[PDB]
């Protein structure tokens, strides 16, 4: 693809394939020209080395350097490693409908509810707001609904309050040591840019209030919402899986 600025970006497989093709063409030319045995053997060895480096660089001999300084990346290199396809792009993947910010206390909350900024919820539940606006007849077209949401009229807030009334969310801390690292809560619209977290779940989350952050995930389908309500709800797991003792005790 052409990079912004009139430049280009390429992968090392293109260069490996280029090398292989060029050496094969040279070998064909030398065979056609009845080259001496020593030259033919040298070309065959070069072709073997090129194919070996294409398949797995750095395995048989020294790795072939890339453009300037670094060695080339091969198919085996892409397959393997922590940054390989299996671990980085197939076992775990970035997802949509997610958000993160700083957490606060908010001691007035109940065990089954948390605090959520208005802007974060407005940004997250955009399709739901669009559908509700279309259904209520306030917006004729989805484009009109999007324009109303961008303008932030007095009715989009009511629509958001209606839709977030009984739709749980998922809160997760970046170290997930045990099962209780992800829990479900019932959002409450608040003013500000910080999430409020119940003090009782602080010990379970192993979180503090000195600049820690947490992630937010919105269940999409009906089955996911019901699973989050029936299994991942904070009130549904008060006992530690490791030992049969309470985990929401005051500190």
């Amino acid at each position: 693809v052409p990079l912004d600025g009139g430049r280009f970006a390429t992968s090392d497989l293109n260069d490996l394939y280029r090398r292989v093709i060029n050496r094969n063409n040279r070998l064909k030319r030398l065979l056609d020209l009845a080259a001496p045995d020593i030259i033919v053997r040298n070309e065959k060895r070069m072709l073997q080395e090129a194919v070996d480096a294409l398949l797995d660089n750095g395995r048989r001999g020294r790795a072939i350097t890339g453009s300037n300084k670094r060695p080339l990346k091969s198919l085996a290199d892409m397959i393997k490693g922590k940054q390989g396809r299996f671990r980085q792009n197939l076992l775990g993947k970035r997802v949509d409908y997610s958000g993160r910010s700083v957490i606060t206390v908010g001691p007035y909350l109940r065990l089954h509810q948390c605090g959520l900024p208005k802007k974060m919820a407005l940004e997250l539940f955009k399709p739901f707001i669009y559908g509700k606006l279309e259904l209520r007849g306030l917006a004729t077209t989805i484009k009109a609904a999007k324009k109303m949401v961008e303008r932030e009229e007095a009715v989009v807030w009511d629509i958001l309050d209606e839709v977030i009334r009984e739709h749980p969310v998922l809160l997760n801390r970046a170290p997930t040591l045990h099962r209780l690292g992800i829990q479900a809560f019932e959002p409450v619209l608040i003013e500000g840019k910080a999430i409020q977290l119940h003090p009782l779940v602080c010990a379970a989350y192993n979180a503090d209030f000195d600049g820690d952050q947490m992630a937010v995930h919105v269940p999409l389908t009906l089955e996911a919402q019901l699973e989050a309500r029936a299994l991942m709800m904070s009130t549904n797991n008060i006992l530690s899986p490791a030992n049969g003792e309470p985990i929401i005790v005051p500190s």
């Binding site: 040298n42 048989r60 001999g61």
Partner: peptide
């Protein structure tokens, strides 16, 4: 001395 090397440059030389 037939082996103990990996680089084809030495064998070509």
């Amino acid at each position: 001395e037939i082996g103990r090397t990996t680089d084809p440059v030495r064998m070509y030389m």
